[PDB]
Amino acid sequence: TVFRQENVDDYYDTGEELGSGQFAVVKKCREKSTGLQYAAKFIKKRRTKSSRRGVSREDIEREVSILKEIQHPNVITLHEVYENKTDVILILELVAGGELFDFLAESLTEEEATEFLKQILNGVYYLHSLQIAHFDLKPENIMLLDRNVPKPRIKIIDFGLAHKIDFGNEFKNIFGTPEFVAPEIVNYEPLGLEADMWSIGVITYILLSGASPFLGDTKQETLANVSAVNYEFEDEYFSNTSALAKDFIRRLLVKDPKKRMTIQDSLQHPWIKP
Ligand SMILES: O=c1c(-c2ccc(O)cc2)coc2cc(O)cc(O)c12
Ligand SMILES: [Br-]
Ligand SMILES: [Br-]
Ligand SMILES: [Br-]
Ligand SMILES: [Br-]
């Protein structure tokens, strides 16, 4: 599939930088014809067939195809795609209140935690209903619309690892951030929608405590901890957190993907269910 090959700068003016990663940089932009504002994600293309640098066309096309499907208040939306020799440029919905990660750096109450978590669950319910596994859920990939309200609204971003799961499981080269990946990822096993549910358990643990459940001193330690389900609820952090909240986490941080709560289970769980 090919994308718009006119110069993006003929149609958009860019401004402040919103985010920066290994192969991508994201800039605020404004569309000249409408005055409407967006986030332009510039993704570096591969220069040769066998290069490890840049993102493969196959990977870019997968991400774009998934993004085009999505329309939901808790997930980022895609406006347009441009490309040139060096980059694919995604014109994405602008979410200006920063990362959940940076907001958290500023411990919540259980209500504040569940207000975020319910939105995340709603977004993931939508995604999983479309058989889309995100595979990179973490506070850095949750953006706030406006961080200056008591109950910020959020959208899930970063579909760079996202895959359609048409056969219940995928078996590809897929591996996200060690603190958040499920044991099946660590062990290079077939992956499904279940991996996201584990990541949600990790996010929930962090929301409530300010601490990461599996984090070791090196990435290898973290990965080994994940695979062994080496986490516990520290009393210093969780002493005034409800046992029902801990139950929710416990049912997500389960090694066997078949025994882990699904997104539907998570919405019916007594901690979440209205
Ligand atoms: O999507 C984003 C965003 C992003 C996208 C849309 C917004 O409205 C705001 C940030 C920011 O930094 C990144 C950084 C990355 O490495 C990868 C990404 O996908 C992103
Ligand atoms: Br700007
Ligand atoms: Br579902
Ligand atoms: Br994104
Ligand atoms: Br994206």
3D structure, described in words:
- β2 and β3 form a beta hairpin.
- The protein contains 9 helices and 9 strands.
- α3 (110-129) packs antiparallel against α5 and α5 runs antiparallel to α8.
- With 274 residues, it is of the alpha+beta class.
- It starts with 11 loop residues before the first strand and ends in a 6-residue tail after the last helix.
- It is 31% helix and 18% strand.
- It has 2 domains: 7-97, Phosphorylase Kinase, domain 1 (2-Layer Sandwich), CATH 3.30.200.20; 98-274, Transferase(Phosphotransferase), domain 1 (Orthogonal Bundle), CATH 1.10.510.
- The protein is globular.
- It has a 5-stranded antiparallel β-sheet with strand order 1-2-3-5-4, covered by helices on one side. It has a two-stranded antiparallel ribbon with strand order 6-9.
- Genistein binds at residues 18-19, 21, 24, 26, 39, 41, 76, 92-95, 143, 157-158, 160.
Q: What structural class do you assign from the helix and strand content? A: alpha+beta
The CATH architecture of the largest domain is Orthogonal Bundle
Could you name the CATH homologous superfamily of the largest domain?
A: Transferase(Phosphotransferase) domain 1
Ligands present = genistein, bromide ion
Distance between the termini: 44 Å
Count of alpha/pi helices: 9
Computed CA radius of gyration, to the nearest angstrom: 19 Å
Question: What is the topology, as strand order, of the major beta sheet?
Answer: 1-2-3-5-4
Helix content: 25-40%
At the fold tier of CATH, the topology name of the largest domain is Transferase(Phosphotransferase), domain 1
| Gross morphology | globular
Beta-strand fraction estimate: 15-25%
CATH class of the largest domain: Mainly Alpha
Largest sheet at a glance?
A: 5 strands, antiparallel
Report the strand count: 9
Number of domains: 2
Give the ordered list of helices and strands.
EEEHEEHHEEEEHHHHHH
